[PDB]
Design an enzyme around this catalytic site. Structure first.
Site, PDB file in Angstrom:
ATOM      1  CB  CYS A 156      -0.926  -0.013   1.222  1.00 21.51           C
ATOM      2  SG  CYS A 156      -2.064   1.378   1.396  1.00 21.51           S
TER       3      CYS A 156
ATOM      4  CB  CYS B   7      12.003 -27.101 -39.852  1.00 20.65           C
ATOM      5  SG  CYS B   7      11.020 -28.582 -40.189  1.00 20.65           S
TER       6      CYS B   7
ATOM      7  CB  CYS C 220      -5.715  -1.319   1.347  1.00 19.95           C
ATOM      8  SG  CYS C 220      -4.915  -0.976   2.926  1.00 19.95           S
TER       9      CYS C 220
ATOM     10  CB  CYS D   5      11.328 -27.486 -44.270  1.00 21.29           C
ATOM     11  SG  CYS D   5      10.968 -29.107 -43.550  1.00 21.29           S
TER      12      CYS D   5
ATOM     13  CB  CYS E  91      -5.724   2.943   4.959  1.00 21.63           C
ATOM     14  SG  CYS E  91      -5.016   2.749   3.315  1.00 21.63           S
TER      15      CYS E  91
ATOM     16  CB  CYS F   1      12.772 -32.081 -40.737  1.00 19.06           C
ATOM     17  SG  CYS F   1      13.099 -30.908 -42.073  1.00 19.06           S
TER      18      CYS F   1
ATOM     19  CG  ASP G 281       6.394 -58.257 -25.139  1.00 24.03           C
ATOM     20  OD1 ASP G 281       6.625 -57.030 -25.147  1.00 24.03           O
ATOM     21  OD2 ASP G 281       5.934 -58.851 -24.141  1.00 24.03           O
ATOM     22  CD  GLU G 282       4.909 -53.111 -25.988  1.00 24.82           C
ATOM     23  OE1 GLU G 282       5.537 -52.059 -25.761  1.00 24.82           O
ATOM     24  OE2 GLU G 282       3.708 -53.265 -25.682  1.00 24.82           O
TER      25      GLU G 282
ATOM     26  CB  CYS H 199      -1.405   2.003   6.017  1.00 24.63           C
ATOM     27  SG  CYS H 199      -2.347   0.789   5.077  1.00 24.63           S
TER      28      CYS H 199
END
Ligand SMILES: CCC[C@@H](C)[C@H]1CC[C@H]2[C@@H]3[C@H](O)C[C@@H]4C[C@H](O)CC[C@]4(C)[C@H]3C[C@H](O)[C@]12C
Ligand SMILES: [Zn+2]
Ligand SMILES: [Zn+2]
Lengths: 195, 150, 227, 50, 44, 196, 763, 110
Positions: free
Chosen positions: H5, H103, H26, H75, H29, H100, H91-92, H8
């Site tokens: 403030c 870019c 405030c 690009c 005051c 690029c 297994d995956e 005050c």
RNA sequence: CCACAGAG
């Protein structure tokens, strides 16, 4: 020991500038401490090796170490050659003052002679800072010896109160006091470790 | 009035460079440690001399002296003259850009001390039952300190 | 390892000190794979991904703006997106934010709005101070993760936490050879027999570390007693 | 095992002192050195190491 | 003020009946002496 | 080493009893420029407790919205600063007249801090409202309790504010000053051994 | 001919006048000289409640000095007291002024009890006595003194060690994650502990009297700091992270709608639990609680609440610094944070309690008599004072003898204060003195109080501690130390304000952390522009002799503060000042000292040597020899082997041994059999061990020479052959010689005492 | 928000009152500051640390594949630097990372 | 009945 001190001083200067490399992954203070500890352990090992090699036969500590009756290689190396770095709680001597070990060394310093390394033999006498650091190490050893006993005895009493009822019955089955089987055979083969 | 009622944002300084901007914050408002102390002493002496030259015959301008509470004694024109009057000493300045204050026959060192961040003013008060008046004599612009030299 | 370790094992305590979970990796001969599998289990807070957090008052609205850079995500190879950060913010309990306030502005900015005295300021100040300490990717109990090399050169991952099942269920970590020194986690995850094996292995490792040469049959007997 | 070299130094210092006839000081961080003890023992006809 | 000694106080602790007079107790026909070596004595 | 010019001290004003306030809520400078002193409305000095109260009429044309103030603070429009005059010996307020430095003692220094009388008024009105609605020797006070009681049960003295007095004050100070020049009594070495 | 390397000759002169057991003696002499006068001056006045005209006032007090006769009164010799099982004591003479009817009767030399004198004090019969007169009184001249003979036994008040009073100690609990700052304010009225803790990230203040944990913003508002910007500037200063931590506490005050001083004061006073004595309003109760209860040692008198507010603000700034990083917490086990309470202070406190009880009971009896109308000459005091006088000496004797220490007025409970002086050897009797007992004994915290901190180099013995469960808790003083004495602080305050310290009531709160702050006894006293020059000037005034040499000055750069320590109990060590790379003690001064003149106090007066405590040592840079001197040095050690204590001095070549062996010898040299004293045959002790033919050590030590172990040894020199002679030396066993034992080697004798009393029964 | 403030020197609490506009009120005051027009904000700059690289130099002297880049607003490059790295379980399918040539803007496929 | 002090 002078070569080890010089290399340690170089590492301290590199840490002070800031370009110290943190290979183990910890912060700069920890990796500097680890490198200094490794260097001081290496110099102690080397001086101890050359000291043991330089002792002739009929040397009483060497004979008592070869026998194995009392003492070891490390004790002879400490008495005749450099004692080595004093280690308190896994680290070097803690800074008991404002970022320094003792008031006899300049502030903000990590040189081996200030952080707890002694370069003097037990035969050659110890400098007062080295004497204080060795007093600290002996004090921590004594206090650990004094205070381990209570916890160890409590643990032993608890274990023995837990395992007091087991016995090997005549059908080769370990059973409790209330005739319940813990193991069908002791250890899976029923062999006493005594025999 | 627009900036007086503008909501004030407090001073914020990063933790790493709080010590570096210490000199800047000190200067903005108005072996190693020994060299720094000498540098501050020289800069402070020049600043005090410039400040004394600035307020020559200027109204509402004041500086507060921090003098020793027990001044050297004197002879009444021995009661030691606890309450003082008349000319006592002089702010002398040397060729090397340094200053000292001679009170009677005692030389003392001078400086500015802590620097304030708020408005100050000097006010004379007269208290009586029939009439009372408080007068704003002027603004207090800085403070200086004089310490005994050993 | 020592008297506290034996005291902490034989007295089976639910919470311990230094609960290391050791995990082997399916691809253990590549540093980048080890780093990216560390990135899944090692928790990363919002403070590690946000340039800043700020609080903006509109004319009649109040919100919190967070700037997430995709540069740190790409450089760390974290499998994290902006909407993932949003839904992670929704999964915070202490903030008590319902899952419809967080919005996406741009491709970086995330806005957290608070709607209604003086309660709005207190609420949004609490949110501002507590927001950069939220977990956005990882496991809550894993304090940190370190990639280590074994003597044969293969790489393993050591984490310090209690989430055994979450560590061994994440993809990229072999779920058959992952173990931990904590015994209650081993029990609650893999049964009483695995708990017994963990007890025997931990006590034997602690005893052989000091070279005291205790016959393992006594250790097996103690393990059969506690289990 | 107990590594008390000070005991050997005390023995040699006492031997050299009693042979010389004067008490010898073993003050911490100093005291009478070993070399003087060896010199006194050699001059008295004993071995240098006691 | 000194606390009084109750039955629970008499049965608990290292000086209670259970750990002081029942699990172990002072026995007769015993002696306590400082030891010293003797190599010419058989090990048994 | 040697001196080029001497700036003489001159001590006077041993009975004027000057005071200095120290505002704890306004900066000395805004920007690099000096600040503007507030206009003064009224002041009060307690004789026994040495309390100072200063009332400043704050701005009303902006950032006020008097509706709140009339709603619960009875339309307060002045901010009050309360301070304690504390003794500080060794303090001299000084000015410069014709290259000559003149000093005068400062009796007390006051730290003016913001005070809220109307908050206490609302609090005591609320206390009366919730206390009168439902009930629900003898001298022991010392320390700061007696000083607070003296500050409460005293009678405030209303003061008058004047400006431009600096010229008359300076003339009186220099008239009290110029008549006397003093001679030293003791040597420098006699200063060291007793409260240097 | 002389050189600097023989500067160790300052050590015997330091022991020639001060003494080795001066810690008890100086404290007891100060007690007898001044604390009796202070205790009388506290509560000399006694008034009746039934007839408000009888007033009884003590004017002067003394021990062993009659007012009429210049010569001191007759006392029994100490050995006669030891044999006859009395208590060696002197009567306490006190001047009295009272009313006999209307006459203002001034009467002198009324006895109020027997105060047990400590041996070799300034009031004892053995003071400055030559060995001829010492032999006349059946007392050994080589006896340390410093113990109280009570009921025949001889007891020693061991020097107690406590955490420093009136100091801010900041500790962190990482497993719980709470940082706190504690202040144990101890004074004559109360000894209360104030905590400032962190709970849930918010800074709270708690006290034993207060029911609830007050928010810190509330108490800062109540303590005169109305504005919140001032609070934030005081706690944090111009810093980012501190404000980020602290803003929550500013918000907390706004949450509780507290904005004026009256609001905070009544909020605090609503929580105060100690309401009694026809309590005043809630606001006044809160004023009293803030004025006295929260921090007892800083009391506020006027309306100005500045110093208390700045104290709490600095405490919270320490707390916030702890929050930022937990490495900046001061160590509780640091020697500089520990103060040593001596026998004089404890005896003064016990006498205070006893005298208060005596005066209360005397007033009760006087009121019991004078309430009745039948009064004759107002029932004179000397008629009814002796039956109350016996209680004083009974309490003193019981408290010294039993070792129990029960003072209800200060709420203090102590046990094991005094110990029976063990006369197993002369060195054992000496080593029982200069023994420091730690504050707590229950804790088994390894690497805590038990570990040997490096801060005690030269202040406490680095090798002497009892083996076993008390290892590290019981310490011993070094050979060359000096425990400080309490000094007044107001002249130091005036000297500070003169030297350039700007007071707190005239400086900015916001700029306060932009320059160094001065602390007096831990309480902030002002700000200093140039701290280095202020420190140098204060040191120069200390070395000149214009202020007491025990006042310590040290600048802590991390806190950016400068501290002055004044209070007693700090352990110190004298050292040689080195300036410009040259030691200030030249060879001419050493020659003057060796010639006979220029004693150690003259070395103090010329600025050649000075006392440093641990905190002062933190700011110094001490060299160990002449060869180690560099231009950056600050002090020079007089001699290093003072770091070993009196007992540790017996070991020859201790620096060649492993430290546990040195500790074992320190523990086991106090059980040696040997000559006890010169009058060991005139003593009748409960168990005494003597040796027929003691011999001097072949290898001595300077510490042995100074403590006069040379005159009364314990042990014999044996011709040892280090070899394996037989199987009977295995596992530390030794092989004695029969002929050597026959001729007198190791011959010893034991003396026991049987006492009996022919009681005269009531029948 | 750490506004203080100017009367005050107290903390500014933002309140809506009842009309729905936030103001820097405030409570010590009479003073507030409406936020009409320009908006206010308080930014706390979080620390920026140097974290460990994972793909630092993972495309040096490697083969280049022909894949369409997702970013076609910058690009038109069709040659991409690719690297095969086993990231999931055995297994995956084996994932890969590719970028690029112009870019950047690295992206991965499983 | 406690508390010291030592011995493993
Ligand atoms: C802030 C500290 C949190 C900590 C005390 C909580 C949080 C996570 C908790 C563990 C998990 O719940 C998983 C397990 C559940 C079993 O039933 C008992 C053990 C088990 C290892 C837990 C123990 C404990 O309860 C932990 C570690
Ligand atoms: Zn306001
Ligand atoms: Zn592209």
């Amino acid at each position: 020991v002078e070569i080890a001190y010089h290399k340690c001083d170089e590492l301290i200067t590199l840490f002070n500038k800031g370009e110290l490399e943190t290979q183990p992954g910890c912060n700069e203070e920890q990796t500097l401490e680890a490198k200094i500890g490794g260097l001081l352990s290496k110099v102690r090992e080397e001086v101890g090796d050359v000291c043991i090699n330089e002792l002739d036969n009929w040397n009483a500590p060497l004979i008592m170490a070869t026998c194995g009756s009392k003492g070891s290689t490390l004790n002879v190396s400490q008495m005749v050659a450099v004692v080595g770095q004093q280690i308190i709680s896994g680290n070097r001597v803690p800074d008991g003052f404002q970022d320094r070990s003792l008031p006899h060394f300049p502030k903000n310093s990590k040189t081996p002679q200030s952080k707890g390394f002694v370069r003097n033999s037990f035969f050659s006498g110890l400098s007062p800072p080295e004497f204080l650091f060795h007093a600290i190490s002996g004090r921590e050893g004594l206090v650990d010896t004094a205070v381990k006993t209570a916890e160890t005895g409590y643990m032993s009493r608890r274990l023995m109160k837990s395992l007091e009822d087991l016995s090997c019955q005549y059908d080769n089955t370990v059973r409790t006091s209330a005739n319940g089987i813990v193991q069908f055979t002791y250890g899976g083969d029923g062999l006493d470790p005594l025999e | 009035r627009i900036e007086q009622l503008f909501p004030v944002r407090p001073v914020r300084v990063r933790h790493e460079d709080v010590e570096t901007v210490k000199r800047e914050i000190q200067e903005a408002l108005s072996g190693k440690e020994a060299a720094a102390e000498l540098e501050l002493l020289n800069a402070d002496h020049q600043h005090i001399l410039r400040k004394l030259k600035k307020m020559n015959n200027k109204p509402e301008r004041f500086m507060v002296f921090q003098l020793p509470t027990r001044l050297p004694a004197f002879e009444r024109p021995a009661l030691s003259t606890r309450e003082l009057a008349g000319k006592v000493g002089s702010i002398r300045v040397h060729k090397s850009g340094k200053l000292s204050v001679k009170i009677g026959n005692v030389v003392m060192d001078i400086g500015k001390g802590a620097e304030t961040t708020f408005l100050q003013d000097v006010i004379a008060l007269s208290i009586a039952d029939d009439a009372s008046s408080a007068e704003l004599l002027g603004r207090v612009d800085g403070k200086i300190v004089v310490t005994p030299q050993i | 390892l020592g008297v506290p370790r034996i005291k902490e094992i034989i007295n089976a305590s639910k919470v311990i000190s230094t609960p290391i979970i050791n995990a082997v990796l399916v691809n253990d001969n590549d540093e980048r794979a080890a780093r990216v599998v560390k990135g899944r289990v090692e928790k990363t807070l919002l403070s590690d991904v946000a340039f800043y957090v700020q609080d903006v008052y509109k004319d009649n609205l109040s919100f919190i703006q967070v700037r997430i850079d995709l540069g740190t995500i790409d450089k760390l190879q974290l499998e994290l997106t902006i909407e993932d950060i949003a839904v992670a913010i929704t999964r915070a309990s202490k903030l008590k934010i319902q899952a419809s306030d967080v919005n996406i502005i741009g491709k970086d900015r995330i806005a957290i709005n608070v709607f209604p005295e003086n309660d709005v300021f207190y609420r949004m100040q609490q949110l501002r101070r507590a927001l950069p300490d939220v977990v956005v990717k990882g496991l809550p109990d894993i304090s940190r993760a370190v990639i280590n090399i074994r003597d044969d050169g293969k790489r393993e991952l050591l984490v310090e936490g209690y989430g055994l099942r979450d560590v061994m269920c994440t993809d990229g970590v072999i779920g058959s050879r992952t173990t931990t020194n904590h015994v209650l986690e081993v029990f609650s995850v893999l049964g009483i027999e695995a708990a017994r094996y963990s007890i025997i292995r931990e006590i034997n490792y602690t005893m052989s570390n000091h070279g005291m040469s205790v016959d393992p049959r006594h250790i097996q007997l103690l393990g059969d007693v506690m289990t | 095992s107990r590594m008390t070299v000070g005991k050997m130094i005390e023995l040699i210092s006492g031997k050299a002192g009693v042979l010389n006839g004067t008490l010898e000081y073993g003050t911490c961080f100093g005291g009478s050195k070993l070399e003087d003890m060896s010199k006194i023992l050699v001059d008295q006809g004993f071995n240098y190491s006691g | 003020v000194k606390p009084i000694r109750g039955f629970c106080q008499r049965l608990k602790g290292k000086q209670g009946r259970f750990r002081g007079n029942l699990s172990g107790k002072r026995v007769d026909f015993s002696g306590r002496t400082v030891i010293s070596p003797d190599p010419n004595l058989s090990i048994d | 080493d040697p001196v080029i010019e001497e700036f003489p001290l001159k001590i006077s004003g041993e009975e004027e009893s000057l005071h200095v306030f120290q505002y704890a809520n306004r900066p000395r400078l805004v920007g690099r420029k000096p600040a503007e002193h507030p206009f003064i409305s009224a002041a009060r000095y307690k004789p026994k407790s040495h309390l100072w109260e200063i009332d400043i009429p704050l701005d009303e044309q902006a950032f006020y919205n008097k509706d709140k103030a009339e709603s619960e603070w009875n339309g307060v429009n002045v901010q009050t600063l309360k301070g304690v005059g504390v003794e500080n010996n060794g303090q001299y307020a000084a000015f410069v007249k014709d290259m000559q430095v003149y000093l005068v003692p400062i009796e007390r220094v006051a730290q003016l801090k913001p005070f809220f009388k109307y908050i206490d008024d609302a609090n005591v009105t609320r206390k009366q409202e919730d206390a009168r609605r439902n009930p629900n020797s003898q001298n022991r006070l010392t320390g700061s309790l007696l000083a607070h009681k003296v500050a409460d049960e005293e009678a405030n003295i209303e003061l008058t504010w004047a400006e431009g007095t600096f010229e008359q004050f300076k003339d009186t100070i220099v008239k009290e000053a110029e008549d006397k020049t003093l001679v030293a009594l003791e040597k420098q070495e006699d200063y060291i051994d007793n409260l240097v | 001919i002389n050189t600097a390397q023989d500067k160790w000759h300052l050590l015997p002169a330091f022991l020639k006048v001060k003494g080795l057991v001066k810690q008890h003696l100086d404290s007891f002499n100060y007690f007898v000289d001044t604390d009796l006068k202070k205790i009388i001056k506290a509560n000399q006045l006694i008034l009746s409640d039934v007839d408000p005209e009888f007033y009884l006032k003590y004017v002067d007090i003394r021990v062993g000095k009659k007012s009429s006769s210049s010569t001191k009164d007759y006392l029994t010799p100490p050995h006669e007291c030891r044999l006859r099982d009395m208590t060696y004591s002197a009567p306490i003479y006190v001047d009295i002024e009272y009313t006999r009817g209307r006459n203002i009767i001034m009467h002198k030399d009324v006895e109020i009890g027997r105060m047990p004198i400590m041996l070799r004090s300034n009031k004892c019969i053995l003071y400055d006595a030559d060995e001829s007169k010492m032999a006349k009184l059946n007392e050994c001249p080589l006896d340390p003194g410093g113990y109280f003979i009570v009921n025949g036994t001889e007891k020693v008040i061991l020097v107690q060690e406590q955490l420093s009073k009136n100091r801010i100690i900041v500790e962190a609990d990482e497993k719980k994650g709470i940082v706190q700052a504690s202040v144990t304010s101890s004074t004559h009225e109360r000894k209360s502990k104030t905590y400032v803790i962190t709970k849930n990230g918010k800074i709270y203040l708690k006290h034993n009297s207060i029911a609830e944990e007050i928010p810190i913003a509330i108490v800062l508002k109540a303590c005169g700091i109305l504005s919140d910007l001032e609070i934030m500037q005081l706690v944090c200063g111009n810093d980012s992270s501190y404000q980020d931590i602290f803003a929550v506490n500013l918000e907390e005050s706004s949450k509780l709608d507290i904005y004026t001083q009256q609001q905070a004061l009544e909020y605090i006073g609503a929580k105060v639990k100690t309401m009694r004595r026809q309590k005043l309003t809630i606001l006044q109760e809160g004023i009293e609680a803030i004025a006295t209860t929260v921090i007892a040692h800083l009391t506020v008198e006027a309306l100005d609440f500045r110093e208390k507010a700045l104290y709490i603000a600095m405490m919270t700034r320490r707390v916030v610094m702890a929050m930022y990083n937990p490495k900046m917490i001061d160590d509780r086990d640091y020697v500089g944070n520990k103060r040593l309470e001596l026998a004089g202070q404890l005896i003064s406190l016990l006498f205070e309690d006893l005298f208060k009880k005596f005066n209360n009971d005397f007033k009760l009896s006087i009121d019991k008599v004078l309430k009745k109308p039948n009064r004759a000459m107002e029932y004179d005091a000397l008629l009814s004072i002796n039956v109350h006088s016996n209680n004083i000496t009974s309490g003193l004797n019981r408290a010294i003898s039993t070792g129990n220490w029960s003072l209800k007025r200060f709420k203090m409970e102590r046990a094991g204060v005094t110990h029976v002086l063990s006369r197993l050897s002369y060195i054992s009797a000496l080593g029982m003195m200069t023994r420091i007992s730690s504050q707590f004994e229950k804790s088994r915290k390894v690497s805590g109080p038990r570990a040997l901190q490096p801060s005690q180099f030269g202040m406490l013995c680095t090798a002497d501690t009892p083996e076993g469960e008390a290892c590290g808790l019981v310490k011993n003083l070094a050979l060359m130390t000096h425990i400080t004495t309490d000094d007044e602080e107001e002249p130091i305050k005036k000297l500070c304000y003169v030297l350039g310290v700007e007071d707190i009531t005239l400086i900015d709160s916001a700029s306060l952390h932009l320059n160094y702050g001065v602390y007096l006894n831990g309480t902030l006293i002002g700000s200093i522009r140039f701290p280095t020059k202020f420190v140098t000037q204060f040191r120069h005034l200390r070395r000149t002799g214009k202020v007491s040499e025990f006042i310590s000055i040290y600048s802590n750069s991390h806190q950016m503060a400068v501290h002055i320590a004044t209070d007693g109990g700090r352990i110190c060590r004298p050292l040689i000042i080195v300036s410009d790379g040259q030691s200030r003690v030249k060879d001419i001064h050493l020659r003057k000292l060796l010639d006979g003149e220029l004693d150690f106090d003259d070395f103090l007066k010329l600025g050649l040597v000075e006392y440093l405590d641990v905190n002062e040592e933190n700011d110094s840079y001490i060299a160990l020899y002449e060869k180690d001197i560099v231009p950056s040095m600050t002090h020079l050690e007089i001699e290093p082997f003072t770091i070993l204590g009196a007992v540790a001095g017996l070991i020859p070549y201790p620096h060649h041994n492993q430290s546990p062996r040195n500790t074992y010898q320190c523990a086991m040299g106090k059980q040696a059999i040997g000559a006890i004293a010169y009058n060991q045959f005139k003593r009748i002790d409960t168990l005494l061990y003597l040796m027929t033919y003691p011999q001097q050590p072949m290898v001595k030590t300077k510490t042995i020479e100074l403590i006069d172990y040379d005159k009364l040894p314990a042990g014999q020199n044996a011709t040892v052959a280090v070899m394996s002679y037989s199987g009977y030396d295995i596992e530390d066993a030794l092989v004695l010689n029969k002929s050597s034992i026959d001729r007198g080697f190791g011959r010893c004798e034991t003396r026991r005492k049987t006492t009996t009393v022919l009681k005269r029964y009531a029948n | 928000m750490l506004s203080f403030c100017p009367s005050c020197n107290n903390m500014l609490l933002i309140t809506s009152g009842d009309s729905g506009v936030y103001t820097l009120a405030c409570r010590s005051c009479p003073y507030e500051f409406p936020i009409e027009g320009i908006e206010i904000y308080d930014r706390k700059k979080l620390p920026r640390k140097e974290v460990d690289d994972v793909l630092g130099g993972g495309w040096d002297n490697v083969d280049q594949t022909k894949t369409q880049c997702p970013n076609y607003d910058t690009c038109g490059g069709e040659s991409a630097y690719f690297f095969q790295l086993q990231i999931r379980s055995a297994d995956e399918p084996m994932t890969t990372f590719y970028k690029c040539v112009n870019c950047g803007h690295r992206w991965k496929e499983n």
